[PDB]
Enzyme design. Structure first.
Site, short mmCIF file in Angstrom:
data_model
loop_
_atom_site.label_atom_id
_atom_site.label_comp_id
_atom_site.label_asym_id
_atom_site.label_seq_id
_atom_site.Cartn_x
_atom_site.Cartn_y
_atom_site.Cartn_z
N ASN B 8 79.37 -38.53 -73.73
CA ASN B 8 79.21 -39.05 -72.64
C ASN B 8 79.11 -38.45 -71.10
OD1 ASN B 8 78.42 -41.09 -70.36
ND2 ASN B 8 81.02 -42.34 -71.05
N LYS B 10 77.95 -38.66 -68.67
CA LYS B 10 78.22 -40.35 -67.38
C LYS B 10 77.52 -39.88 -66.16
CE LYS B 10 83.16 -40.56 -68.43
NZ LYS B 10 84.46 -40.98 -67.12
N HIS B 93 82.10 -49.60 -71.13
CA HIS B 93 82.66 -48.23 -71.01
C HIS B 93 83.87 -49.21 -69.86
CE1 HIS B 93 84.18 -44.72 -69.15
NE2 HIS B 93 83.64 -44.00 -70.52
N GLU B 95 85.23 -48.28 -67.29
CA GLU B 95 84.04 -48.03 -65.22
C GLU B 95 83.04 -48.51 -65.49
OE1 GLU B 95 84.65 -42.58 -66.52
OE2 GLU B 95 82.98 -43.94 -65.73
N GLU B 163 89.56 -47.00 -75.41
CA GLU B 163 89.91 -46.23 -74.15
C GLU B 163 91.47 -46.93 -73.86
OE1 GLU B 163 86.56 -47.96 -71.98
OE2 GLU B 163 85.62 -46.39 -72.46
N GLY B 169 94.31 -41.66 -65.50
CA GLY B 169 95.00 -41.31 -64.41
C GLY B 169 95.98 -42.40 -64.68
N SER B 209 91.30 -38.64 -72.61
CA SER B 209 90.08 -37.52 -72.57
C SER B 209 90.02 -36.86 -74.05
CB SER B 209 91.34 -36.75 -71.87
OG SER B 209 91.10 -37.52 -70.14
#
Lengths: 246, 246
Positions: B8, B10, B93, B95, B163, B169, B209
């Site tokens: 991905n 992005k 996703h 995001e 995910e 984060g 990650s």
């Protein structure tokens, strides 16, 4: 003002249909110094469309990210568009405001990103049926325009689009006379916020329903400088719409 | 199960950077009949990326429209993707769920559209830190999966992605075992919603990650069938991540 005729293909197209359509478009002999003609294909069709269209045609994309490069899955940054020499972007089309809840702030930030990356922007706004019936046309349009108008750094490079949402899917029809008055008022807002020469310079397009029949009545109005054309731009007869600006 | 390693990208890349990266990717000799390797470039990069990547690498797009063809400015329909032979789509996703407020309903409609057009879908979900700390991991994932899971008819053509938002984060780090424990629960959910054979068929990827240092420990886990990779997939050493699944 240099007339500006734009094809918003929206979510339409195949490799084959674009091949035939661009070919018919190419048959039209126009001078790109005398009018701007911009085609907005689907993102994944951009390269196909750009290659097939002759150089007289400008090209762009239908949406740009408010974010720069980075972790934003599904987005196209202004930086990426610049690298590809994608000349134009559409910002704030009513369909994106409607289906994807794009706000005035999103419009502002998308314009910022675009201008910072030397992209030319076609920015859409307009009031709903409820808003117009409640006599808020100017209140709404002023608010929407003032959300981004102060950012314009070149008045050839940003192009405004009035979208009469009140006349879309409602059964109402916006007459050229009605559209002209709104365009006149949009120009005044630009005058008040940016300056008279700036207001006199900026293209304001009609972004309602435009076809081969009504295009002349619209573009001949003093403050209407062209169109962002929907489904009529998917037809070979789109060249006749371009002809109204020639 | 056929392992599945996905890139991905992005919102990243230039024509030059893709040219250099695809070239390094092409140096890796793998058998596409035994391993799925998929690259997801930015929409406007798709043509460039597809032409440069050898066909052993499958390709897709990072998002797809919940609507069909029509008046949906800025969107790419499943039918347009099918016409361009775009094999894969990413749906849901985190995001897009976060920045663009995509819902379970959006994910469902995107999956229905994709499958109707014979696209293969990489479908993401996962719980936040707040949700994990409330001991609601299973509850959240069950709801997210059940939003779309009944649409799956061919369990080779839908790929699930966990995910761990709780470890993105937040300062927390998911261990491969903690990932495994969720993957096993996901498969159990599929088993009870769709059937045992179907659950054993479906690929479930880790979409946290992933890098060269942790890929091997992750793929060794019994219920982790591959990865949807972020930053590490923008590097030439992404070939080492593919190698861990070979």
């Amino acid at each position: 003002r240099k007339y500006f005729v734009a094809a918003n293909w929206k979510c339409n197209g195949t490799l084959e249909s674009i091949k035939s359509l661009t070919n018919s478009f190419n048959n039209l002999d126009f001078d790109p110094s005398k009018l701007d003609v911009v085609v907005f294909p689907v993102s994944v069709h951009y390269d196909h469309t750009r290659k097939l269209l002759q150089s007289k045609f400008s090209t762009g994309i239908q949406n740009v990210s408010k974010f720069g490069n980075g972790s934003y899955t599904g987005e196209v940054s202004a930086e990426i568009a610049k690298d590809l020499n994608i000349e134009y972007v559409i910002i704030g089309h009513f369909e994106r405001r409607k289906y994807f809840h794009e706000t005035d702030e999103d419009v502002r930030e998308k314009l910022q990103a675009s201008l910072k990356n030397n992209l030319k922007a076609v920015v859409s706004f307009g009031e709903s049926l409820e808003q117009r019936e409640q006599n808020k046309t100017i209140e709404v349009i002023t608010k929407q325009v003032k959300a981004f108008v102060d950012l314009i750094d070149n008045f050839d490079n940003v192009i405004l689009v009035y979208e009469p949402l009140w006349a879309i899917g409602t059964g109402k029809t916006a007459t050229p006379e009605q559209a002209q008055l709104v365009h006149k008022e949009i120009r005044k807002i630009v005058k008040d916020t940016c300056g008279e020469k700036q207001a006199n310079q900026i293209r304001i397009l009609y972004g309602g329903s435009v076809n081969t029949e009504n295009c002349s009545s619209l573009i001949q109005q003093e403050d209407i400088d062209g169109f962002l054309v929907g489904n009529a731009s998917l037809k070979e007869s789109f060249v006749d719409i371009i002809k109204s600006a020639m």
